RNA sequence: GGUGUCUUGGAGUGCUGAUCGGACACC
């Protein structure tokens, strides 16, 4: 059902917290 | 909130995208 809204593309978390 | 789609530097320890949350059209 939900594919698309729980798999993303690419995009790096830069350590933010 | 749900369904389809996309999200960002929207969140998120994943060895960096799974899971979640919103928007848009429809309900």
């Excluded at 059902?1 to 917290?17: G, K, V």
């Amino acid at each position: 059902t939900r594919q698309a809204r729980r798999n993303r593309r690419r995009r790096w978390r830069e350590r933010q917290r």
